[PDB]
Design a protein around this ligand. Structure first.
Ligand SMILES: O=C(O)[C@H]1O[C@@H](O)[C@H](O)[C@@H](O)[C@@H]1O
Ligand SMILES: O=C(O)[C@H]1O[C@@H](O)[C@H](O)[C@@H](O)[C@@H]1O
Ligand SMILES: [Co+2]
Ligand SMILES: [Co+2]
Ligand SMILES: [Co+2]
Ligand SMILES: [Co+2]
Ligand SMILES: [Co+2]
Ligand SMILES: [Co+2]
Ligand SMILES: [Co+2]
Ligand SMILES: [Co+2]
Lengths: 700, 701
């Protein structure tokens, strides 16, 4: 087990009694269709069922045999059509499916039925997943349809193949051999994502390279799109807003200039000539030095709509990112909301605003982005981070399922109770239909795709939750563990719990209690809570914590930056009152004296120290848990995860010591005597922050 | 087949009659020894014999059974000791071995015998290679010993894991998880190299990062050294000469300053505390902006000997590179020789001067470095390039065996006939202390290690030739093809010939007839023969070709730069006379009229055009040959190679068109009508040279 198969490990079912039951139920595979998508589904079931059932199961179009798996749509499978499923199939829409044990002409069958070929593909992966996770097929009757339209992955890949915030190898896209070489890995990539129902990929960096739009690269990109197409995955590209200028075709990129409008229209025509089902564009504009409409004195709707008009005739959409923040505003927290709220309703219907979970930048815990509860006439989609930019690159174990679930189940009170982020994303709160979730996965050429084996779990949870935003972190972990490692209950339970606590451990040894943005700049690998004196104050650490001798925290109430007024009144009320604000967010909104007493009975200084030490203890406990699993895991992945956890414990100690000593130097309070005192001083940790190997190929 | 096993593919022998013979001969595996190295040999034989013979063969220390493979030294194997092999075995030295079908206590056996445990490991790999290449074991009686002492690989790896002139992925060394995580791939890397007898590795870039010497990194590096040790591979590091300054410990790096001398002594003590058998240092100094003794007004012997003194108490060596050339000399070709000859005899005995094959920079064909025939009182070693910096990155097929053989068999006449480069390296010409060969391999994390499958063949040939410098490119290709793809004769023959022509094809479409250095600067991906106006003239293209309306070539005879006078007289004579100079080197030494008539009957302009067009035709023929092999190769590697050959053909056309049109613009002569006229004009190719995606993660400064 080198991890190349990820969670699609088609190994013989270990439970011998259960295996016999599956072998009795699925003796044949019946597939009448022959479209590329159905062929992909048939190929997956043939390899999957053959591996899991430990016998050759070959896809055939022959007279129906007893105990068959039968797949198709009413349009390509007369057997499925003969069942007259009607309304039951109608509720499934364009991507849903039905899995059911039933009878066709007295033959025992299990059907994978859908309206479309892609629905059949998704249903086929779910059928395999039921077997992978040792679920019974007897009396099976279930249907599912995705809750979000655009379920996409994002890759911050540069064309030189270095990945920005990439800890898993070089970019998968081998430009030097494209379009000529159709590497099997491109198909495996499609299989991995299709297994989760992901239907779109943005292959290139948001810090966008205009070359992706050149003929040379569109031909290369078309080969990738061709490989992804049978798996239902549309191709998307990040664009550079100054492309008309970069190509030397127009002397401006102003979206109101007709020559610019025309340049994009012609470029869209060129794209669709190579990729007739091209999805559209991802846009990072007027942010962190990336060009945009504001560079020409135009607004974000003017820029987005210009691109959207170029795509409209071809059915393309614009994912316009809301990650924008000017350095001269009072409070970066307020930035995106103040930029986009005035534009609510001004965007075309093929524009979707892509918004990070929180208003800062993927920090270990952030409150929900106020834009989600404020934009009522604009399509929106979520952007989550999977790659561990802020959770320890490829050496820390940090399952992100809990972060995603926490976000999705957050009640916003935007329009009564039930205004959860998930419900907003689904479109039910504000009544929009163009919906989605994007996940910044940044995998690479490492054999296991993600570097750290457990980053696979985060990619997994993300795709499951993009399909159904109410799926819990626990449910996704249970499936992933079964698929990736073992179905042994004695293994599943402790490892699931280890996964579930890992996110919180990552918060605790870095920045608990509402602290944030304490990382070394600009690499983000280790601690640097002392960081000050950068060209922009909002890229420093002290800007966020505002620690002094008397207190800590950032006042975002009415008496401070009043960012709380950007939220619905029930949220502003709950978070603005010290009696009701969650302690896990408190320092985002309140500047508190070090003597403030917390729910635990500790004062704030004591609670801060307790949290930092708790995070290290949580890592140590993960170490012990993992060591207990040696009998259930292959020796190679066991040894790898054991080793990485040692690296993580060492780094967590460095984080803890650096931060506790830093805040001690500012507060002037002792570390309570029960704790192991750091043996080195703050100056030593400032030296480790200069000399600690930053393990990433890309650099700021 | 994803190429991860490279040439150690232990799959069942396909010839069923032959398989049965092997199965009859090797029924058991007997190993009495238990040192780490013997254990590694035993594990290799267990997995190798089990795979090749398609039956479980487990290494055991039990009473000898009939039809056993028995391995060991007289010191660790009483069975081998009982044969009283004496002088025959002893003559094979510290790394050699004997493979022999014989009898012990009336049992039929095949022995893998050596004086040392590493000799047993090397012999075990040769035993497996005999089976992998379908050689008979009946009456087997062969011995071998390496002809060079230091058989080393070099990795131009940066600590961020980006590889300089690396076309095969990120650096293998995962610094973020070291030393804690002992990745299996580190052992597989040691197996690959040990299978060729490679006994050293320099893991980091010659453009050296001082951090490798920090305690933090030495701990990491020690884990790698630990993984490599059972396989006989010593660890070496490239050093930055300014390290005492970079560490903030000394305000100078002057090798004559006692504080500097002491810094390195203390540093060596720290290294050896982590890695007790550390091999030593590779040094790129006073070259291309890298620091060195000349920065302190000292010479390269003063610098090298300072480092060598630090290592001497621990048995370490300094590989001091001769790749040095100042921008203000009249002819770069003369540089290394003029720098180092005055220092011949001044280097300490644990210093070895590491010299590239040619005096420029790994160009597709270079004449031999004159230093090899001149330095008669200094230890020398060869440096060859495997990574295809100048042969097309990871997209062109270019087996380098012929380049290495061409070099090693070149007669230099240093001390009369028999003064081949190989014999010089072996120590037979000048009678020297330390010998060796280094190969810049630059593999990475790509599943197949080398990107292009065929780069594996170059690494293979390199290690084979480091063991025995008289091994031909053809022999190494025959072995490699058998081990990597197929033993079918109908496959081997045409693919071997394809491999053998591939180097020449790469010369032909880039820079034939003694032309050189026509690449895009500084990435080296594509053609740029017009390159002029760089900060240093010796980094341009025009500096080398000197093309004009009347002629082309660089005068290195007595009437020009007289670089020929740096060679032994018979070479200076042969190359300086137009009647005897090889046409494949001619423009290195002569500036010739475009009307000069070549051996073929063509004038020089016509010959130049013919060679550039021939190179493209040679790639097209490689495509046709490869297509004919579909039945013999697995579908995945077949498809990959087919596709890469398409990329190569397209790029070779770009090269051809760019260079022919460029030289045409200068000569003002027509491309003969028999040749297909380029798809576009010279200005268009000057545009493709700005627009053509450079497929490498690393970029020049
Ligand atoms: O989302 C973004 O555009 C940016 O997000 C930040 O988290 C990363 O540090 C930066 O590399 C990205 O370009
Ligand atoms: O040998 C060397 O030091 C140099 O060789 C040249 O061929 C390479 O362009 C350069 O990247 C190396 O550093
Ligand atoms: Co893994
Ligand atoms: Co980059
Ligand atoms: Co735990
Ligand atoms: Co206190
Ligand atoms: Co290969
Ligand atoms: Co670099
Ligand atoms: Co050929
Ligand atoms: Co002519």
């Amino acid at each position: 087990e080198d991890g190349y198969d990820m969670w699609l490990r088609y190994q013989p079912i270990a439970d011998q009694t259960l295996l016999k039951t599956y072998q009795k139920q699925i003796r044949h595979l019946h597939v009448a269709g022959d479209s590329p998508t159905i062929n992909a589904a048939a190929a997956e079931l043939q390899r999957g069922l053959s591996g899991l059932l430990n016998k050759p199961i070959v896809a055939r179009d022959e007279k129906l045999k007893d105990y068959s798996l039968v797949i198709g749509t009413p349009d390509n499978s007369p057997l499925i059509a003969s069942l007259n499923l009607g309304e039951r199939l109608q509720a499934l829409g364009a991507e849903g499916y039905l899995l059911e044990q039933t009878r066709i002409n007295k033959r025992h069958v299990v059907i994978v039925a859908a309206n479309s070929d892609v629905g059949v593909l998704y249903g086929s992966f779910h059928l395999l997943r039921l077997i992978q996770t040792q679920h019974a097929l007897e009396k099976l009757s279930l249907s599912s349809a995705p809750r979000l339209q655009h379920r996409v992955v994002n890759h911050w890949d540069n064309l030189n193949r270095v990945v920005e915030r990439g800890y898993a190898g070089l970019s998968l896209w081998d430009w030097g051999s494209l379009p000529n070489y159709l590497a099997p890995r491109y198909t495996d990539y499609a299989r991995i994502n299709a297994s989760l129902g992901i239907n779109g990929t943005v292959i290139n960096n948001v810090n966008a390279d205009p070359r992706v739009l050149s003929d040379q690269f569109l031909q290369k990109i078309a080969a990738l799109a061709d490989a992804f197409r049978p798996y239902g995955i549309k191709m998307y590209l990040s664009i550079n807003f100054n492309s008309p200028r970069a190509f030397g075709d127009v002397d401006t990129a102003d979206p109101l200039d007709p020559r610019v409008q025309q340049w994009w229209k012609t470029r869209a025509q060129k794209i669709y000539s190579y990729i007739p089902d091209f999805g559209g564009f991802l846009v990072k504009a007027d942010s962190e030095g990336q060009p945009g409409p504001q560079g020409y004195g135009r607004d974000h709707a003017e820029g987005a709509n210009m691109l959207a008009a170029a795509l409209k005739p071809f059915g393309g959409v614009v994912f316009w990112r809301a990650f924008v923040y000017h350095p001269d505003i009072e409070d970066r927290f307020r930035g995106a909301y103040d930029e986009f709220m005035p534009l609510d309703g001004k965007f075309a219907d093929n524009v979707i605003l892509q918004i990070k979970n929180g208003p800062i930048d993927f920090q270990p815990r952030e409150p929900f982005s106020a834009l989600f509860a404020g934009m009522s006439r604009t399509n929106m989609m979520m952007e989550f981070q999977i790659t561990q930019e802020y959770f320890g690159f490829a050496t820390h174990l940090a399952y992100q399922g809990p972060l995603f679930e926490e976000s999705l189940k957050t009640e916003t009170h935007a329009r009564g109770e039930g205004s959860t982020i998930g419900n907003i994303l689904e479109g039910k709160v504000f009544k929009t239909r163009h919906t989605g979730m994007a996940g910044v996965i940044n995998p690479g050429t490492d054999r296991n795709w993600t570097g750290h084996p457990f980053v696979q779990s985060s990619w997994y949870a993300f795709g499951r939750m993009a399909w159904d935003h109410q799926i819990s972190a626990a449910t996704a972990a249970d499936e992933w563990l079964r698929m990736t490692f073992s179905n042994q209950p004695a293994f599943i339970e402790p490892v699931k719990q280890m996964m579930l606590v890992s996110r919180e451990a990552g918060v605790n040894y870095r920045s608990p209690l509402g602290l944030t943005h304490l990382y070394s700049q600009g690499d983000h690998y280790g601690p640097a809570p002392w960081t000050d004196d950068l060209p922009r104050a909002d890229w420093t650490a002290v800007y966020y914590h505002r620690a002094s001798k008397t207190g800590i925290g950032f006042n975002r109430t009415k008496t401070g930056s009043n960012a709380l007024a950007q939220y619905p009144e029930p949220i502003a009320k709950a978070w603005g009152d010290l009696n009701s604000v969650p302690e896990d967010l408190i320092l985002w909104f309140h500047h508190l004296s070090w003597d403030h007493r917390m729910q635990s009975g500790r004062n704030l200084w004591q609670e801060l120290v307790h949290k930092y030490y708790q995070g290290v203890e949580q890592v140590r406990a993960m170490q012990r848990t993992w060591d207990q699993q040696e009998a259930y895991v292959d020796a190679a992945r066991f040894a790898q995860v054991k080793a990485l956890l040692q690296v993580q414990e060492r780094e967590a100690v460095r984080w803890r010591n650096s931060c506790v000593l830093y805040f001690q130097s500012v507060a002037g309070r002792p570390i309570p005597a029960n704790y192991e005192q750091p043996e080195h001083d703050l100056e030593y940790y400032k030296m480790l922050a200069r000399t600690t190997y930053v393990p990433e190929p890309w650099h700021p």
